[PDB]
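User: Here's a protein and a ligand (magnesium ion). What would the complex look like?
Assistant: Let me lay out the input and then the predicted complex.
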Amino acid sequence: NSNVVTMIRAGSYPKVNPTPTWVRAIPFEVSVQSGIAFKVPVGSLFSANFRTDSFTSVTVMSVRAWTQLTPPVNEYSFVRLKPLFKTGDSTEEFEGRASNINTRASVGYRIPTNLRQNTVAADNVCEVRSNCRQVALVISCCFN
Amino acid sequence: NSNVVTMIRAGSYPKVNPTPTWVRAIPFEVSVQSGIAFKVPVGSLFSANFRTDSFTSVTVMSVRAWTQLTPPVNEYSFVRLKPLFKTGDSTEEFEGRASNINTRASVGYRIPTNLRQNTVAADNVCEVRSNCRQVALVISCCFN
Amino acid sequence: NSNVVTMIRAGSYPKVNPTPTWVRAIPFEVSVQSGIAFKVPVGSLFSANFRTDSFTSVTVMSVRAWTQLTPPVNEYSFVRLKPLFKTGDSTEEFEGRASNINTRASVGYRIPTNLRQNTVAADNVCEVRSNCRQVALVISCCFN
Amino acid sequence: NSNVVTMIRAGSYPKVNPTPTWVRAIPFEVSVQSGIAFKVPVGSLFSANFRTDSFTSVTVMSVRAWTQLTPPVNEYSFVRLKPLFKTGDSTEEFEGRASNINTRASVGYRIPTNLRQNTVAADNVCEVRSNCRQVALVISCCFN
Amino acid sequence: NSNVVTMIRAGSYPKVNPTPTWVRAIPFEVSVQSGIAFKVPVGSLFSANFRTDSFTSVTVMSVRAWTQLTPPVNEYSFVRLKPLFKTGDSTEEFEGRASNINTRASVGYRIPTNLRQNTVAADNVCEVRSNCRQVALVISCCFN
Amino acid sequence: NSNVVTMIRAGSYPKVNPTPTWVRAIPFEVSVQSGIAFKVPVGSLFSANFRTDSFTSVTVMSVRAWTQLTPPVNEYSFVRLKPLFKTGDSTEEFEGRASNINTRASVGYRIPTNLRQNTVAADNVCEVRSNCRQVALVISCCFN
Amino acid sequence: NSNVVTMIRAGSYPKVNPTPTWVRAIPFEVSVQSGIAFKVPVGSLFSANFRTDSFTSVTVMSVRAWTQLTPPVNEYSFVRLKPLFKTGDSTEEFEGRASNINTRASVGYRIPTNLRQNTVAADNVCEVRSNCRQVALVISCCFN
RNA sequence: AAAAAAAAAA
RNA sequence: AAAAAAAAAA
RNA sequence: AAAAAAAAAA
RNA sequence: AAAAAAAAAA
RNA sequence: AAAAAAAAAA
RNA sequence: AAAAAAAAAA
RNA sequence: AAAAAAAAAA
RNA sequence: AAAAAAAAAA
RNA sequence: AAAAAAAAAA
RNA sequence: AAAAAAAAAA
RNA sequence: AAAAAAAAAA
RNA sequence: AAAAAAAAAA
RNA sequence: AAAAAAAAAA
RNA sequence: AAAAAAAAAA
Ligand SMILES: [Mg+2]
């Protein structure tokens, strides 16, 4: 291959965009109480910690959740997700349970194309229920 | 295709990275004086205006330059690029000229693999000369 | 085939969901006045009569309508449907007419993928007009 | 694909059913005492928690069971299932044991076609034995 | 081919619609001031000048823009487009620049299927920025 | 498919037309006396009710007619169409009759290419005769 | 194709005929009394209402008949045709009956080649019988 | 499956 | 015969 | 797709 | 042999 | 079926 | 390469 | 894709 | 059409 | 050449 | 997919 | 990749 | 191996 | 030779 | 015979 700088024969000025979209997998944790649902706010996805603080909207594609701390004594971990939407909340309760007490439970759901509109910081993604005090989420989304 | 949320059968917690790399084409302008070379600082690529203020290093891959304002009366636009590098500056003067007084002049150079190390805000990309008072740059780079 | 119970060699505890989605064709009637349009509420679709009282949202896919009573003397039955949407109402008036006075008139419309968002009880599906005093609807939808 | 509503050329009024059947996998737990068998009532499957409170009969196809709490000290989890039938109870004791003390034990059984009649709330599905204080069941059935 | 009127053997009365949908490319102009973004209202698309005054909703599919007057002295024309959405505004700034001072600058963007819902007169399509005092827009859209 | 807005690399300003042509099937009704021909005016086709009030000309391609009310006692419906043209009226009498007293009569005629000139609101399409007091027309035409 | 008049290189004066033959399907109605046969006169086919008043002879090829008014209460329509010929009358009674009280009855017969001689106004085609007071006839014939 | 009108593309 | 939902399986 | 009547053509 | 108009057919 | 002049096209 | 108009030809 | 100048190689 | 980054899949 | 909307057809 | 035990069949 | 339930379709 | 976003190429 | 129940296997 | 740098070309 080349070992020196070489000339590019550029032409006209291209179409440009200083502030493009970005397809991402955002990891973050939320704290949960026993037997009480926690609504996950979209605003959690806008943070300098993720290089995403310059965005104001995001299109969520899929949501996956793991338990992040150990469960109560005698119990296996579990986590439930209930999808939420601005045009109408769901009542599905997708649930995963561990089969080894020392292991995370996990579950996720995919959002269909007809429901992939933008959300803003004030919106919510889903409700989380778990017998563990922390749940780790990984959300796949397109920032725009 | 599906019209409702569906279950994902997630497994172990994956490898994650909250602060990933980003391949970009960054557009910005600089002011140049007649007969005086202008050193383009790498720090210009780190700005909230480009969603890149969270990075501190970047690997520049190629530089393209267009004249941005009209040339002096009776002349055609021209722009020159001289590559700069921390381990040793170049003396090439890649030059483009307009063939129509009303049109931009353009030129670019590609940086070879063996010279694609990181730069930081205090470093310089290249020297620009032009008979126009502004030059528009589009730099292809990998933020990391 | 087997005539007795046989063992299943079950494995880890699976992903579960106690409240799944349901793809349905719901049949109900509405009362129509002459010359006056009737707005069909989405809330009609949530009812123990359909096994759907546990849902709060629904994604409507297609609407079909039939006249359910005889037309006025000398007339042939007709029915019109005007689609309604929360992001903006349509002005189409899909219309079916009977070619035999003793026969139902019918018409339907399909909602495109890009408009299949959720609707809740307070929302409306469409407007119905008819010269018959009742209209029977069958709505294809996904409860979620 | 289409971006707007389009007409459907509906025909005669179709055959309809407002209360269809539903093929389901229902997950619930039961409390078990040491040394004592627990009869699992069919009535557990009818509940608003499963969107099934509108059904009065169900045809059970297969039963699967997992231990839901940790076993006694020094022991590995186990669970046994004895199938029950209105025309005559079985004496099989399908049994699963854990090979890791921290792991659920599991077992299931399939009901043959010739024994898939309806069962109502007063009937029983099976007997459960376990050295763990709770057992999680998933039952595959057709509500009708 | 035939030179006279001939008979059609028509059948039963068909499904009809007196107010159908219309796929269109609407051309119009907006006035913009330097350094100020102009929000383009959807209501611009409803006008007798386009035969569209009888619609109240539209699904926007793509937006293209051109500069419509000459740029300031010594400058090349430019135009930026920032998409707007009811469910959440974007921060992209799609930009095109002229390479001959006597030529229009142009740029455009396409709206994805998941974001093609309806918009009414009070909604906005996008923000426009330019150094030219007028910008010509051509919007591909579906009136319904 | 794509889930976010993407750039279009627009070129030169295209050819545009804010007021285009429209191929339509227009349904309307006319009142008829027994034994008396009714001349159907072309102006019926220009109406806000059809989104056509901005057109002043139209090219009729085909005419189809149905009886719209029940026939006199003891009779079967019938309907006759006689084409009219500015350059010379026809004397054809295309006729349809019902074979069931409860059923619409219908007939149609196609206009040949050499006769597809423009007509204006003061022109006439055809003559209608029927033993029913109302006739329903569906005209296929091109508005220009 | 050509858009202007063009020359024909005509030759010798051709064979001509100002009064050609005409294959036609003539529709007309006759009045019938209960229990009485009606002889259909051939003269009914020579009329300005059919553009045939310039013919004095006709060759009848086939005869079809429909009932034209409702039958008496409780009865289904029927119609009978008995062919008549100048060289000798038939005694067949081709009959058709309705299977729905509201629909027309119909029947017809074909005249074989050996019997297709000319007929004039004073001749008869056939005898009609019917329990309906009017019968509609369509006769396929060659005017010469 | 072919065609006309409007839209969009390689 | 293809595709979407819930269930079951090699 | 075949046949009759009228028209036109290689 | 191909086409238009009227008629008839599988 | 080939060619020239004017027009129009993929 | 196909077509229209004028011309010319086997 | 072919050629010249400089460099490197099987 | 090939390659790099992020995302997603059999 | 493929697709959407309106129209027409075997 | 092959085999042993019990059952059943062309 | 095959089969059962509810939905939709050529 | 197929797809989306950003980049680059024939 | 195909199938059901129990057992054993690549 | 393949490649890099500079030049020139279809
Ligand atoms: Mg009937």
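Summary: The domain at 1-144 of chain G is CATH 2.60.120.220 (Jelly Rolls).
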